[PDB]
Amino acid sequence: DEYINDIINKDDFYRGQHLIYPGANKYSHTIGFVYGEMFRRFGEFISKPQTALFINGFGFGDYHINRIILGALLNPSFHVVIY
Amino acid sequence: YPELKEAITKVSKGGGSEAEKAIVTLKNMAFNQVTVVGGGSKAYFNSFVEHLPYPVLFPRDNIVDELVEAIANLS
Numbered sequence: 001d002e003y004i005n006d007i008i009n010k011d012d013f014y015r016g017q018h019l020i021y022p023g024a025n026k027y028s029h030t031i032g033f034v035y036g037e038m039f040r041r042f043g044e045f046i047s048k049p050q051t052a053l054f055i056n057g058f059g060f061g062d063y064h065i066n067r068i069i070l071g072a073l074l075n076p077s078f079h080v081v082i083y
Numbered sequence: 084y085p086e087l088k089e090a091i092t093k094v095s096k097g098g099g100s101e102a103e104k105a106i107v108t109l110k111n112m113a114f115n116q117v118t119v120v121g122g123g124s125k126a127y128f129n130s131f132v133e134h135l136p137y138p139v140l141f142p143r144d145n146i147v148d149e150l151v152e153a154i155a156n157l158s
């Protein structure tokens with residue numbers, strides 16, 4: 001109701017730090033915090049023992065994920081099925 | 084001691100150092116607790132490498148180089 005529609009169809013109307021997407025404002029610590037924390041929870045989640053990880057139907061268009069997986073092979077409980 | 088027969092020949096013919104006489108006198112014992120090994124390389128350190136047996140249950144396939152090269156290439 002309030003702001004999305006104006007952005008869509010209000011022509012010349014833009015402002016500063018009001019929206020957070022997609023990975024937009026990383027030069028500001030406040031925003032980055034969110035993505036860094038989600039990735040931190042993900043990375044320390046795979047460190048768990050007896051945990052199953054799934055990578056299904058992925059094009060592997062990212063770089064950090066592949067390198068992290070390669071460096072995290074120390075876990076003998078990695079199983080992957082990809083389409 | 085690789086120089087086993089040489090010590091025997093020296094003592095039989097005469098001569099030899101104190102170590103040769105000591106090994107000769109302590110080797111003459113006919114006990115199962117003492118083992119005699121002779122050869123040009125059996126008593127050397129090289130022959131000891133192969134004497135180690137692999138564990139029955141421990142895996143024998145080598146998959147460390149594959150992991151290292153995968154990490155080097157993909158990561």
Ligand SMILES: NC(=O)c1ccc[n+]([C@@H]2O[C@@H](COP(=O)([O-])OP(=O)(O)OC[C@H]3O[C@@H](n4cnc5c(N)ncnc54)[C@H](O)[C@H]3O)[C@H](O)[C@H]2O)c1
Nearest residue numbers: 021022023024034035036037038039057058059060061062
């Ligand atoms: N907390 C986090 O997890 C985190 C961390 C850093 C960045 N980000 C976000 O990441 C930044 C950009 O990421 P992105 O959009 O480039 O990643 P992405 O969404 O493009 O990665 C997945 C993509 O791969 C495409 N693809 C191509 N071939 C495919 C195939 N055969 N199978 C499946 N998918 C295939 C898909 O269209 C699409 O899903 C954003 O700016 C930011 O919001 C998130």
